[PDB]
Amino acid sequence: ANRFTSNIKGLTQAARNANDGISVAQTTEGALSEINNNLQRIRELTVQAS
Amino acid sequence: TGTNSDSDLDSIQDEIKSRLDEIDRVSGQTQFNGVNVLAKDGSMKIQVGA
């Protein structure tokens, strides 16, 4: 039972940590998407100015 | 399909590669109370007869 509860607590905490990783990836991809929007505006401006 | 170019094909390719890496990871890191189940071809015997 001691080994069992050790595994249980470890797996629960690891699942929580995976959720935190999901959140980090989400915020990073949001920043990347806004950078992509800026790049698209730059590309349109270049097509205009060419 | 043939409508997608190589630049459009690299995305599908790296997604497939990430999925395969995840498959390998979950195949190699799943264990029940300290013994793995997807790493060896050995059989398990359960004493069910006294």
Nearest CA distance, B26 vs chain A (angstrom): 14
B35: which strand partners? B32
Looking from the CA of A21 toward its CB, the CA atoms found within 13 Å total 6
Q: Does B35 reach chain A within 8 Å, measured CB to CB?
A: no
Output DSSP code: residue B33: T
- Amino acid sitting at position B35: V
Find, among B17, B31, B6, the residue nearest to A11 by Cα: B31
Q: Does B34 reach chain A within 8 Å, measured CB to CB?
A: yes
Residue B38 and residue A8 in contact, taking contact as beta carbons nearer than 8 Å: no
- Show the tokens assigned to B46: 């359960």
Q: Does A3 reach chain B within 8 Å, measured CB to CB?
A: yes
- Amino acid sitting at position B50: A
Q: Does A4 reach chain B within 8 Å, measured CB to CB?
A: yes
CB < 8 Å to A4, chain B: 33
Resolution of the experimental model in angstroms, please? Answer: 3.4
Nearest CA distance, A50 vs chain B (angstrom): 24
3-state secondary structure of B32: strand
For residues B43 and B34, what is the distance between their CA atoms, to the nearest angstrom? 16
Residue B40 and residue B34 in contact, taking contact as beta carbons nearer than 8 Å: no
